[PDB]
Amino acid sequence: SNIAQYKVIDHAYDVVIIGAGGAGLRAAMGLGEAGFKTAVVTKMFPTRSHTTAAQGGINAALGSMNPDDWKWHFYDTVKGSDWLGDQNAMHYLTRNAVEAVTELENFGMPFSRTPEGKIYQRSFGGQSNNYGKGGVAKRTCCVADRTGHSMLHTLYGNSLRCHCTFFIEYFALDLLMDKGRCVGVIALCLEDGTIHRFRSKRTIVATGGYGRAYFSCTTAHMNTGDGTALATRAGIALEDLEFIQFHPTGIYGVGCLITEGSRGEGGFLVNSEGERFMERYAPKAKDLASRDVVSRAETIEIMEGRGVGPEKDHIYLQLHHLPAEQLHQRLPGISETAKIFAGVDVTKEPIPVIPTVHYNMGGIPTNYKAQVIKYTKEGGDKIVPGLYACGECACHSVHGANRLGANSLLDAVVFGRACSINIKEELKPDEKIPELPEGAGEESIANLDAVRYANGDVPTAELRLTMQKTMQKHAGVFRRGDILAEGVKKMMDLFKELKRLKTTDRSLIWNSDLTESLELQNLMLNATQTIVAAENRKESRGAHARDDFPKREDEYDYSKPIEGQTKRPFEKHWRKHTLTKQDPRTGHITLDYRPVIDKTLDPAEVDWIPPIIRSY
Amino acid sequence: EKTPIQVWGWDYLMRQRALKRPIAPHLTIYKPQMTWMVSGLHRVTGCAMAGTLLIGGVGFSVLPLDFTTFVEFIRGLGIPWVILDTFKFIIAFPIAFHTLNGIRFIGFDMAKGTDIPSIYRGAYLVLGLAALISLAVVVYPRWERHKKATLPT
Amino acid sequence: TSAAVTGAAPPQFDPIAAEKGFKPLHSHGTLFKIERYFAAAMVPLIPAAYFIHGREMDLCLALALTLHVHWGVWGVVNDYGRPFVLGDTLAAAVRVGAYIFTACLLAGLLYFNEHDVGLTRAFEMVWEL
Amino acid sequence: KRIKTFEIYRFNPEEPGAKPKLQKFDVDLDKCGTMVLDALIKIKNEVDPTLTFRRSCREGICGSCAMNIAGENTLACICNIDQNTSKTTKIYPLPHMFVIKDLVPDMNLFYAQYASIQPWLQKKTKINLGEKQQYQSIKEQEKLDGLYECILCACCSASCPSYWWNADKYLGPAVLMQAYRWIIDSRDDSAAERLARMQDGFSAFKCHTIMNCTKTCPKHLNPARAIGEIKMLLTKMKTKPAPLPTPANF
Ligand SMILES: Cc1cc2nc3c(=O)[nH]c(=O)nc-3n(C[C@H](O)[C@H](O)[C@H](O)COP(=O)(O)OP(=O)(O)OC[C@H]3O[C@@H](n4cnc5c(N)ncnc54)[C@H](O)[C@@H]3O)c2cc1C
Ligand code: HEM
Ligand SMILES: Cc1ccccc1C(=O)Nc1cccc(OC(C)C)c1
Ligand code: SF4
Ligand code: F3S
Ligand code: FES
């Protein structure tokens, strides 16, 4: 850190939360409730966190509309994870879904109500009553079109009562580590350019995902997957990074989300020939089939020319057939959102949409206790002390290969709640606040000091763009071994351009040029790991679909009957998590693979669902 | 006697001064709109009249002048058939506009007429009746005295 | 290096802890009510002054006007007579002045009714030009 | 070469004894997106990266990008660039706020005031958390429509001249409407004590019905109005029809 001097500021808390998104805030409320001196660290105001932009709804088996068993939720979630989903985590999610969302009503979330006065639910993507046998399920509870805005503002409000101390606009640089143990976090106070070291017995990572690793995305600009990168720079393997979900109905132009609620209310996808083409691709579910299918099904129509508009390159979402007193009631957000960015009167015209990057199931590997883990091939799942994770940045996993619709706001909440529940217990008040080793994150700063005065000939702005495109091309909805190899070749050579970086802005106080550069740093780690994982995965499963490996590789062939066959070895078949372990400095990436936890938590409360062929 | 938040609000203002932090512009930069321009002209006139009543009530008291000398003094120049009623219109309008607008500005204390159509309508409505009543009050006796120069009896 | 100083938690408003002690119930609300009532009552009055002139009207005008302008100037004195931009006691000077303005106003108007044309007659005479 | 020219407010606290500035930035509208924010980014990305400013969402739902654009307080991301290349779009920060750097202002007071209204659900009978849905009717919950949407951009408090003057004491439109939002929520019980906290002559009443809040607001909402009901509520010219009856089969 030679070229400057820095104001270093220590602290001491019980538990630090890097994140003020749904998960981080819920996590905080429970810890305040428990009585911990809880520091919430966020690189922007909590209400600006991504959650806010969420639209469709949040999932729970409430049966405000009709009878519902959470076990039917649990099913559609395991089939949604294309059996790459650790079911012990999914069991936790779907069991407590009804308690957690009810909590939110009890925190003053203004859920839309049915005439009965109950929480109005709608239908959504990839759900169904009676274990896939029955109808299309109505579990997706909502505040009409704007569920995530109202969930966050509510969760935040209630966290002003938890006596939790807020560090707002603080960019977290690294997880402060002591040989296996997370003793705290380091950050940069944007307000005064001071550096802050937070000592803590625990550390919850709720940073969200890396939607900006791709060119087009519904995500917000601050989806740079920092927490995911922090873990890597502390020496942890990330999980299932190649599984990037593509949301079907992202607007043609900017890529802003048009909800799946727009489809769950009775809207549908129409090609250049005026065919509701999803009725072919999904005989049963139609336009409420899972997102990886619907987004693929779009791309097929485009790539075969029946795409619409002046480039025959996107398609339509249709709402000019639903009654306008429902559009206005159930979809006012997208109504205006479409009317602004597309100029579309949704009651008169369709909305030009296209598959778009949205959610990263992939993240920091954890158990069901939302605790970060490492995975030796012999020792197994060895946890990381003083470290927890939840939200989009985590991979429990409750989404394996494909996240279900309306499940993340729940994943954010339930496992945020879980973080505190699980910490309240396993933390004990005799355990003193850990001291920092001398010269902690002297590198963390050095790194910053480098980027701050960046001297090379590549503008930080341009190196991002070329990453984003190099990505957009190679790791699309349909990917192939030759493309991916050729992607990895470019991405790894873009990584070497990091030493050739340029930044003009030199100031400490509110340097959006410097901070964005650290985001790019973090994004490049995620991205590199995303594509090397994808290149290597020789199968089609969930979001990640390989033209050259278009069957779901499983222990058994599951189309044929089970008995009579003979289970493959762990090496050949791909029912396993992808654990990329990048060398933060050089960029070398090594892999290893970890089993899917098939068992539930209580075999007495529910049965583990056998892998059947995922059809909608 | 401050509420706990308004205490904090002060301590803040201090802390904000401390940092020599500049303040964003406002009147300097903000655009003219019929919401607050009207607010200005309600309060501009409101005051002007009260300052008149002081400059009038206390001014004529302290000074030796009675009002009857003043009314005669101006007829000294005996300014044009126009320029008088101009000043009459200038004197009616602050009372006219204000008093009308007072019924409107009470409205928005009751949530009555607070949407942008109701705001912008009322703005023209009040200016209309203030233009009418001040012109009508001023050009009525003037059109009764020039109804002597030629009259029946 | 990490030869740091230990810092403190950032300044923040605790609405639960500020709830200790706070009993202020000096319900200004009922005063607002009467300001507006009165002003609505003056809606017929201005017409009445146009039509029914006289010394006793002057008195209703000079009583009401001094009472409504008193409430008015106090408003404008609080908006612009700010402690921040004036310093505490100097703001209290304007503050007190808002009451001086009222008492000087009424006396100014009372002198004029009782030793001059009066409000009503003053308009007749200037409209007569 | 449809070169739009921009006059952006500039300022550097780093630079010793420096003062507010105005910089002119030119932008090729053919090489740019349709929204103001796109240019500001384009500018940071291609021209001067020191141009510091707040963004997060692109869809106008976060509240981060509040600022002044051609004399009005609005969100950049969903405000359209003025296509007339002979003219300039004049970009300043949110009026009468202390500026940190360029278009970034300190919020904390605004944030702190919205914290003082106890923006969360309060009920006298201690109910259990994840146990039961509380009752609220379609008519009841629909009241909040117009209130719950506020993203806390502060375009409205930044436009209110009464806020400019007495910002420390007068809560300002956006914060008030959230105070109101929690008042009329049927499920909410401690609604009198909420009024109790802004009974004084500044907190609430210093609203001189100017109406910029409602006119400037990028989400088309109406604070002036909810202030209305507060004035009626505080004067006891009105009060809320208390909770509807939660039926015994619900
Ligand atoms: C357009 C859209 C619509 C959606 N709709 C739905 C829906 O209807 N239902 C549903 O279930 N899910 C939905 N999702 C998914 C869901 O909203 C998110 O995945 C979820 O809200 C993530 O919450 P989180 O707490 O993990 O992190 P986020 O809400 O993403 O916030 C991340 C937090 O981490 C902090 N952070 C990041 N980096 C740093 C750093 N370096 N230092 C310090 N702090 C940092 C940020 O300040 C931020 O507060 C939607 C997503 C999008 C994009
Ligand atoms: C006759 C009917 C009148 C009505 C209904 C009326 C109503 C009102 C109202 C409601 C206000 C408060 C508005 C606010 O707070 O912004 C006000 C303020 C004021 N009025 Fe009047 N008024 C009337 C006549 C007058 C007259 C004749 C004067 C003459 C001097 C006057 C001077 C003022 C002043 C100085 C204020 C100051 C506060 C301000 O502008 O904000 N008013 N009036
Ligand atoms: C503060 C106040 C209360 C009630 C009625 C009017 C005002 C008032 O003068 N606003 C105001 C004050 C100064 C300037 C301004 O316009 C600027 C945009 C030029 C408006
Ligand atoms: S009200 Fe309209 S303007 Fe005032 S904050 Fe909420 S949204 Fe921004
Ligand atoms: S702009 Fe200003 S004073 Fe009252 S109603 Fe709107 S706040
Ligand atoms: S950046 Fe989200 S409000 Fe425009």
Residue numbers in the entry:
A (entry chain A): 30 to 645
B (entry chain C): 34 to 186
C (entry chain D): 28 to 156
D (entry chain B): 33 to 282
Recite the paper's sentences.
The enzymes of the fumarate respiration are anchored in the inner mitochondrial membrane where complex I (NADH-rhodoquinone reductase) acts as a proton pump that is driven by the oxidation of NADH to NAD+ and coupled to the reduction of rhodoquinone (RQ) to rhodoquinol (RQH2), while complex II, serving as a RQH2-fumarate reductase (QFR), transfers electrons from RQH2 to fumarate. Since fumarate respiration is the major pathway of energy metabolism during adaptation to a hypoxic environment for many species of parasites including adult A. suum and bacteria inhabiting anaerobic environments as well as some human cancer cells exposed to low nutrition and low oxygen conditions, the pathway is one of the most promising targets of chemotherapy for both parasitic diseases and cancer.
This observed difference in the orientation of the interacting groups between the inhibitor and both enzymes explains the importance of the electron-withdrawing property of R1 substituents on the effectiveness of flutolanil as an A. suum QFR inhibitor.
